[PDB]
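Hey, weird one. I pasted the patf sequence into the form twice and got a warning about non-standard characters only the second time. First submission, copied straight from the form history:
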Amino acid sequence: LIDRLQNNQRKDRRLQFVRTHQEAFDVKPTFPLPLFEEAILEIEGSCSVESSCQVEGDRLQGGRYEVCNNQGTTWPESLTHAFKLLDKIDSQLGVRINRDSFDRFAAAHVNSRKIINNTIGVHLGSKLEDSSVMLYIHIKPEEDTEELARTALVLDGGRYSDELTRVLLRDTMVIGFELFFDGRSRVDLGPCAPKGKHLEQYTQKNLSRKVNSIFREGYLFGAFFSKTRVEPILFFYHSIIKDLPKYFTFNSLGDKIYNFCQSQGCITDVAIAVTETELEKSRLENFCFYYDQWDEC
């Protein structure tokens, strides 16, 4: 009985995270946000909700969430949530989804024992056609996962140097599939470091001093590469929110997100996603700010 009651309370907290974020950042409940809220209520067990704001100068896009079960391995049953969501979204008039890459990856690795889960997520854009479904595959850190990374690399179809190919083949811990509602899709390969030594080395040899001076200060460092990206997007994960001002200076919108985060409970970690190029600037104008809340808080 107590497990059942706790289970209903997690579901309520999940929704409250998502709603509190909409309130704080003036997000309109535009398609597909209502549908997404219904979808995450169907996830069993305890979930983490990772909300974010994409900032672009004085523009802020706040209707961005990734949700997943945070209690061990739910692959491949976690796929059912993704497919249900995609089915609901595709049936919307004026929405077109190219799910080929995700379907092929899912088909290929359904029986893999090296995958923790997939997430489900949505990113609202300024208009319907710029909005997307976002799906991340989280790979087990302590497995040799070259075969997963190869499949993703093939679906991405980018051409990388020998050095970067090895980083991607060996240290990829997350794979992103972004499905835009105008029919564009993207595959992100996500090498991470606390796996990691190839990314660390690549970073030390190739990336700016500013990147090198901060990337080991959080508990995790990641970079997303894609054929679609001229340069990777770098992610800096921190478990102590108050440490962010030590390493980043924000434009006004970033300060607002930062302040909001420091007043909110239940936050287990934050991340700043930014390009090397944008990190060179005196102030961050173009970046994404992520924060993660656990529904048992």
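That's the output from the first submission. The warning seems to come from a hidden character in my clipboard, not from the data itself. Residues 164 and 202 are 7 Å apart (CA to CA).
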